[PDB]
Amino acid sequence: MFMINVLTLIIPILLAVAFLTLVERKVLGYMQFRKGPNVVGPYGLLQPIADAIKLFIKEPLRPATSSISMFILAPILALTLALTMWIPLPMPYPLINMNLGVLFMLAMSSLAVYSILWSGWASNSKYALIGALRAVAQTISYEVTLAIILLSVLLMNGSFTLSTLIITQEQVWLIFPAWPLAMMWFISTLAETNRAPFDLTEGESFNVEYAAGPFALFFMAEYANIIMMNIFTTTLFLGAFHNPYMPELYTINFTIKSLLLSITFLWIRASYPRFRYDQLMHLLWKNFLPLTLALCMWHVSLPILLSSIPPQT
Amino acid sequence: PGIVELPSLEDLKVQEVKVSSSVLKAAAHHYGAQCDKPNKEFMLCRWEEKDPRRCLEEGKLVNQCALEFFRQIKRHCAEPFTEYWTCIDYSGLQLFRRCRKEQAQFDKCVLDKLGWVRPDLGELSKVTKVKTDRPLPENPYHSRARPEPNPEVEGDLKPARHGSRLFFWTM
Amino acid sequence: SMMRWNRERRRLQIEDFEARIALMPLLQAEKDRRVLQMLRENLEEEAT
Amino acid sequence: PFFDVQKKLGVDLDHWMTIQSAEQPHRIPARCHAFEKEWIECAHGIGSIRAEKECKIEFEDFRECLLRQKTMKRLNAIKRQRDKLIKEGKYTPPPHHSGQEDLRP
Amino acid sequence: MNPIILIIILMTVMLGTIIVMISTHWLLIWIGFEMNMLAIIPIMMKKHNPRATEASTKYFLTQSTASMLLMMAIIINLMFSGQWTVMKLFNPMASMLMTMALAMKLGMAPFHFWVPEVTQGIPLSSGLILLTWQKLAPMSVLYQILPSINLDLILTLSILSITIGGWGGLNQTQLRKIMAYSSIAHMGWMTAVLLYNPTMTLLNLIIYIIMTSTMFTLFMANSTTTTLSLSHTWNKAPIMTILVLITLLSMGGLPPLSGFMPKWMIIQEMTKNDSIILPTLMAITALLNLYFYMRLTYSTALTMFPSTNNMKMKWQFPTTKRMTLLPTMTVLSTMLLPLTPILSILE
Amino acid sequence: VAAFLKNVWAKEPVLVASFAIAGLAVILPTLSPYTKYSLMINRATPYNYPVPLRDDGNMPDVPSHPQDPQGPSLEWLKRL
Amino acid sequence: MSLVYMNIMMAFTVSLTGLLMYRSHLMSSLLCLEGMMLSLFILATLMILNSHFTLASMMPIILLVFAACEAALGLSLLVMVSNTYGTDYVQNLNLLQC
Amino acid sequence: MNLMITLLTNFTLATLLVTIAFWLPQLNVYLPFSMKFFLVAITFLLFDLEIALLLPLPWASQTTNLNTMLTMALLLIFLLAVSLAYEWTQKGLEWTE
Amino acid sequence: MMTYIVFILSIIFVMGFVGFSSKPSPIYGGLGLIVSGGVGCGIVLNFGGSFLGLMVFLIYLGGMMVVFGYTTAMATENKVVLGTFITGLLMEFLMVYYVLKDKEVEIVFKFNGMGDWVIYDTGDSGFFSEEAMGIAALYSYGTWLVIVTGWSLLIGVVVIMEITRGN
C-alpha cells in the first residue's frame, strides 16, 4: 500500500515532465507570435509521446568514454536525485514526513552536481569537461544563496519541517514578509536548474556525448527539478489554505500556483538574453550574496526585536 | 556484585488506564487540574528516590486517581467528551486549535455538571509544593564514603634553609 | 501578520506542552511498571 | 605549560562541554550522569595518583555504564545458553517472550 | 605579502599555540593545532618558489596526519572516559596515539624526516618560527598528559631523536639542515627528562629557544644559509664570528656556557631516578652535535677562509637589518650558567 | 557625508541596501521594546516537567496547586 | 564494546594505511586523509549520540568544519604543486633531499 | 524503513530507465589549468563551511540566552561578510566576479 | 538480519574505505569516498543523528567532495590496487566471520558480536531532538567555539588567497 503511494508519486512526476515539454513548446510558440506543436496529436497532445518513441529508437552515439562506470552513473544519479527531491514535499501531506525535510532537499540538491561532473569527465572531449566545470561552478555558487535564503525564511518557520511551513503561512503568504528573499530565491532556483537566462550549456560563449536515450534521461531529470523547485518555492513563499477534512483544496491550490510558477520560468526564457558567465558570477557573488547576508542578519534579529520567534515543534 | 531486587509480578498489577492518547490529550487539562495531588506526590517521589521500585504505591495512586477521573466523566459528560476527543483524534498532530467548539461544549458541560475549571495558560507548568509523609532520601545515589582530602598548606613561609642548595650555590 | 501569528503559535505550543505535562505522571507510572514487568520476566526466564 | 587563563580571569571558555554531568540544554541528562557525578565527586581534589586507587569502584561502574561490556557479556552468556537449550530441546520460550501477551499500559 | 596580513597571520599562529596552552577541553587543543597549521602555511610560502611549496606540502601532510592521530586519541579517550578534560588519558592506546601524534608534530625521530626538508625549503625567519614557536604547543600537551605517557615509548623516541639528530648533522653543509638536526637532538633531550621532571623539560625548551633564536638571528643578520657563505663573515663583520663562536660552543653544552645548563640538570634529574646508563649515553651522543658545531666554528671564527673581491664593496655599507634582540639573546645564550638556580621560576 | 551617500546610492544601490539592512539588523534590537518579550516567551515555554518541591513548611510563594494565585503567571502573554 | 565501533575504527586504520602508503598521486593521499576525517566524524557521532551527551553534539560539526578547511588548504597546496610539474605526483616533490 | 524502500524504488526505476536507454537501440543493426575555477570552488567550500555554522539558527532562536545568541549569530554572518569583502577587495572575485 | 542493519552499513563503510584507500585513480577514489560518506550518514541516521547525517550529505559530500572531484577533474584530465582491495576485503570478512561465530572478538579492543541495538536508551526526549538542542547550544553555550571557528574560517579564506596567488 505504501508502494502504491510511491508509484502514484513518481509516475505522475514522469507524466508531468513529459507534458511540461509540450507546455513549454506551446507557450514559447504563442509568446513568439506563432503556434507550437498542433499537428501530431489533437491540440498537439501526442507530441511528447512521439518524441519519446523517436528518442528511444535513435541510433546510439557510441562514445569511446574515459570511464564506462561514471558514464552510466551520471544519468542514474541525476534521475534518482530528481525523484527523491519530491518525497518530503507537503502537498498537503508528504510521502515521507520527515522532521528535517528542508535540509534533506538542500542536501539532495547539493548532490546533483556530481551528475554534471561525472558526465563531463566521462566524456572524452576536453571542452565538454570545461563546460561541465563551468556548470558545476555556477551551480555551487547559487547553492550558497539557496542555503542562506532558505535559512533566513525558516527563521520564520521554527523548524526544518516542510509541513510546518503550511502552518507558518495560514494568516499571510510568506512572500509578504520575505519578498526580497523570494525574488533572489526565484532567480537562484532559475540558475540552479541551468535555466535561461543562466543556460550556458546552450550558449556558444556538458552531456553531448550521450545518446538520445540518456540525453532524454538527463532532460527529464532537469524538468523534474524545474517542477520540483517551483513546487518548493510555492510551499515556501505562497503557502495555500489547508482544510484537514478536505486536503484536495490545498492540492488544487498549490498545483495552480506551481503551474503558474513553472509557466513563469517559461516566460523568463522567452523574454531575456543570456548572461555571460562572469556576469552571472557577478550577479551571485557581488549582488545576491551581500543582500542575502544582510537579509539573513535582518531575519535573525527581526523575530527577536518584534517578539515573533516561531515555535520549535 | 549483589543481586538486583525486582518487585514481583503481583506487586505490579494495577487497573490500567486503557484509553488512547487523543482521549488523554482531550482530558489532559482537567486531569492536571483534578488529579494534581497524587500526580505531584508521585513525581516528587520519583525525582527524590531516583528509583521506580521505591515509587510503586504512589504510582498506583496515580493509576487509581486517573480512573476515578474518567468514570466521573463517563457518568456525566460522556457524549461531549467523546465528540471532543474524536475531533482531537482526527488530526495527525492532534491539534487543540482545530477543535475549539467541541472543547467549548466539553468545558461547558464539565463546568456545569461537575464544577471543574480548565486551567489557564501557564498554570500546569508551575512548580508546586507537595506535603509528603515519606522521609527525604538521605543518600539517593547510594554513594559510599568520599576519600579524605590531602592536607592543606598552613604556617608562615620561612626562607629556604641555606638557599637553593643546588650543588654549590649559596643563595 | 507574522508577529501576531507567531505569538499565537507560541501560546498554542505552551498549551500542547502543558497537556504533555499533565499527562507525564500517568505515563511515568506506566513506564515504571512496564520496565519492571519486563525485567521481572527476564529474571524469571534467566532463573529457568 | 597549562597557563590557566580561564581560572585566572574567571571566564568559562570550554569547561561547559568538558564533562557529561555539566549543565546541559533543557536539563537533558547523559545516560551515565549519576556514575560520572559519583566518579567526579569521589576523585575531586585528592589528585590523580590517589584517584587511581581510591576511586576505582566508581570509575569501573562509570566505564561499565559508558561501554556496557559486562552487561553485553552477560547477555551473550544468557542468550548463548538459551540457544543451546533450544537446540537441545530442553527449553521452550514463554508466550511473553514470543509475542502473545498484549503489553501492559 | 601585505604587512597587515602578515601581522594577522602571525597573531593567528600565536593564537593557535595560546589556545593549546590555555584550554581544558581536547577539542580546543585540536582546534589550536589546526589554527596554528593553517596560519603557518603562508609563512612557509612567503617567497613563492617550488622548494617552499614542497616544504609546505610535506609540512601539511605530516601535521595533518598527526592531527588526525591526535583526534583519534581524543575520541578513544572519550570512549573510555566519557569526558574531554585535558589531563591524563584513560586508555594506553589513546596515550600511544597521542604520544605518536605529538612526536610527529615535534618532528622527533623516527618521525623526524620532515624537519630538515621543511626547514631547508623555507626562509630563515619562518624556520626560526618552525624550530622555536612550533615546539611550544606539543610540549605543553606532553606536559599535561605525562601521568599516562608510556615510559619505554617516550625514552625510545628520546634516544632515537638524540642519536639520529647527532648523526644527521654531521653530513650537512646547509645551515638550515644543521639547525634542524640540532633541533631533533634537543627535543630528544627534552622528552627524556619529561616523565622524571617536566621543569627540566621547560628549562631545556627555553634555553634551546634562546640559542636557536640567536643562531637564526645571526644567520639572518649575515644573510648566510650555507657553511661556506658563513665563512665569509670574518671579512665583513668580525663581531658576528665571535657571536656565532660563543653561541655554537654554548649549543654544544660546553661549560661555563648556558647550554651546559639543561643537560647537566637533566642528568641531575635522571640519576636521582637511578637511570645512569641513559644520561651517560645521551651525553656521549651529544658530542656528535658538538662536533658539527665545532666544524662551523672552525669555518667561521677560528680560521679565515678566502673571500672574494666584491666583498670590498660591502665594506662600504652598514647592516640596516633589524637584528631584533640579538645582543640580549647572545648574552642569555652564553652567560647564564651562574644563574642556574633561576630554573625554579619554571616550577 | 551627504554627497558621499548620494554618490554610492547612485553607483552601488545593492551595497547601500546591504549595509542599511545589516545596520538595522545590528542596532534595532537594542532599541526595540519587544526584545524583552522574546526572552520572556522563551523562558515561559515548558519543555521539561515542573518537578515539584517538598513542602518543608515555609514556602508562601510556591503554590500547592496550579490554579492557586501564587506562582508565575502568563497574563502578559495572553494580553500583550 | 559495541560492534559498530570495530568497523569505524577499522575504517580509520584502513584509511590510515592508505594515507601512510602513497602510490603516486597527492590527491589520493588527500582522499585518504579525508576518509580518516570521515571515520573520526562517524565514531565521535556514534559515541555522543549513544551517551546522550548533549553539548558534544556540536563537536562533530566543528570537527567537520575545521577539517574541511584543512582539506581546502591541502587542495591549494596540490594545485600549486600541480602548477609546477604538470601533475600532482609525489615523486616530483624531492628537491629537498639536498 | 519507508524511506529506504522509497530510495530503493527511485534507484531501481532510474537504473531500469538507464538500462532501457542503453540497450533498446542495440536491437537495430545500423585542458590547461584555470586558477579562477579552482578559486571559485574553494570560495564555495569556505562559505559552505560558514553556512554549516549558520544552519542551527532556527533552533538557536529558542534559547533563553538570547543576547548571547543574537550576538554570535550576527557575528557569524558578519564574518561571512568579511570573508566576502576580503575576497572582493583583493581581486579574488575577478573575471568570474 | 534487520537487527544488524547498523553493522551491515558499517561493513559496507569499511568496504568503501578499502575501495578508495587502495587508490585506483583519484576519481574512483572520490566515488568510493562518496559511497562511504553516504553509508556512514546512514549509520549516523540510525543512531538518531538526523542533523549530523544531513551535514555529512550537505557539507562533506555536497560541499567538500564536490570540490575534491572538481579539482581532480581539473588536474587529472592496476595489480597493486586489486590485490590491496581483495586483501582488505578478506581481512574485513574474516573479522565478520570471527565476531559472528564467537559473538566476541579482540583485535586491539574487545568487541561484542551482538547486534548494536542492545546499547540504546529505553526512554524518550519529549518535544525535542536532544542532538538538535545540543547543536543549537553552539550559539548559547558555545561562544568561544563560534569565535575560534569563525576566526579560523576567515583566516582560511585569507590563507588560500595568499598561497594561490604566487606573488
Ligand SMILES: CCCCCCCCCCCCCCCCCC(=O)OC[C@H](COP(=O)([O-])OC[C@H](O)COP(=O)([O-])OC[C@H](COC(=O)CCCCCCCCCCCCCCCCC)OC(=O)CCCCCCCCCCCCCCCCC)OC(=O)CCCCCCCCCCCCCCCCC
Ligand atoms: C648596606 C647596603 C649596601 C651594602 C653593599 C655591600 C656590597 C658593597 C660592594 C659592592 C659590590 C658587591 C659585589 C657582590 C658581592 C661579591 C660577590 C662575589 O664575588 O661572590 C663570590 C663567589 C663565591 O665566593 P665566596 O667566597 O663563597 O663568597 C663571597 C661572598 O660571600 C659573596 O656573597 P654571597 O655568598 O652572598 O654570594 C652569592 C652567590 C655566591 O656564589 C655561589 O654561591 C657560587 C656560584 C657562583 C657562580 C659560578 C658560575 C660558574 C660558571 C660560570 C663561570 C663564569 C666565567 C668567569 C668570568 C668570565 C669573565 C667575565 O653569588 C651568586 O650566586 C651570583 C653568581 C656570581 C656573580 C657574582 C657577582 C658578580 C657581580 C659583578 C659581575 C662582573 C663580572 C663578573 C664575572 C662574571 C661571572 C660571575 O665567587 C665566585 O663564585 C668566583 C667568581 C667571582 C665572582 C665575581 C666577583 C665580583 C666582583 C667583580 C668586580 C670586577 C669585574 C671586572 C670586569 C668584568 C669582568 C671582565
Ligand SMILES: CCCCCCCCCCCCCCCCCC(=O)OC[C@H](COP(=O)([O-])OCC[N+](C)(C)C)OC(=O)CCCCCCCCCCCCCCCCC
Ligand atoms: C518567488 C515568487 C517570484 C518572486 C519574484 C520573481 C519574479 C520576477 C522575475 C523578473 C525576471 C527576472 C529574470 C532574471 C533577471 C536576473 C537579473 C537580476 O534580477 O539582477 C538583480 C539585480 C542585479 O543588479 P544589476 O547587475 O542589474 O545592476 C548593476 C549592479 N552593479 C552596480 C553592481 C553594477 O538586482 C539585485 O541584485 C537586487 C535583488 C533584489 C533586491 C531587493 C531589495 C529590497 C529592498 C531593500 C531596501 C531598499 C531601500 C533602502 C534601505 C531601506 C531601509 C529601511
Ligand SMILES: CCCCCCCCCCCCCCCCCC(=O)OC[C@H](COP(=O)(O)OCCN)OC(=O)CCCCCCCCCCCCCCCCC
Ligand atoms: C554511486 C552510488 C549510487 C548513487 C545513486 C543512488 C544514491 C543517491 C540518491 C539517494 C541518497 C540517499 C540518502 C539517504 C539518507 C538521506 C537522509 C535522511 O534519511 O534524512 C531523512 C530523515 C531525517 O528526518 P527525521 O524526520 O529526523 O527522521 C525520522 C525521525 N522521526 O531520516 C530518516 O528518515 C531516517 C530513516 C532511516 C535511515 C535511512 C538510511 C538510508 C540508507 C543509507 C544511505 C544509502 C545510500 C548510500 C550511498 C548514497 C550515495 C552517496
Ligand SMILES: CCCCCCCCCCCCCCCCCC(=O)OC[C@H](COP(=O)(O)OCCN)OC(=O)CCCCCCCCCCCCCCCCC
Ligand atoms: C555595520 C553594519 C554591518 C556591516 C557588515 C555587514 C554587511 C552586510 C552585507 C555584506 C557585504 C559584504 C561585501 C562588502 C564588500 C565591500 C567592498 C566593495 O564592494 O568595494 C568595492 C565597491 C566598488 O565596486 P567595484 O570594485 O567597482 O565592483 C564592480 C562594481 N562597480 O565599493 C563600493 O561600492 C563602496 C562600498 C562601501 C560603502 C557603502 C556605504 C553604504 C551605507 C549605507 C547606510 C549606512 C549603513 C550603516 C552601516 C555603515 C556602513 C558604512
Ligand SMILES: CCCCCCCCCCCCCCCCCC(=O)OC[C@H](COP(=O)(O)OCCN)OC(=O)CCCCCCCCCCCCCCCCC
Ligand atoms: C613557557 C614558555 C611560554 C612561551 C615563551 C615565549 C616563547 C617565544 C618563542 C620565540 C619565537 C620567535 C620567532 C620569531 C618571531 C615571529 C615572527 C618573525 O619571524 O618575525 C621575524 C621578522 C621577519 O622578517 P622578514 O621580513 O620576514 O624576513 C625576510 C627577509 N626580509 O624579522 C626578522 O627576521 C628580523 C630578524 C631578527 C628577529 C629575531 C626575533 C627573536 C625572537 C625570539 C627571542 C628569544 C626567545 C624569547 C625569550 C625566551 C622565551 C622562551
Ligand SMILES: CCCCCCCCCCC1=C(C)C(=O)C(OC)=C(OC)C1=O
Ligand atoms: C518513458 C518516459 C519518458 C522518457 C523521456 C522522453 C520524453 C521526454 C523528453 C523528450 C524531449 C522532448 C519531448 C522535447 O520536446 C525536447 O525538445 C525541447 C527534447 O530535447 C531537448 C526532449 O528530449
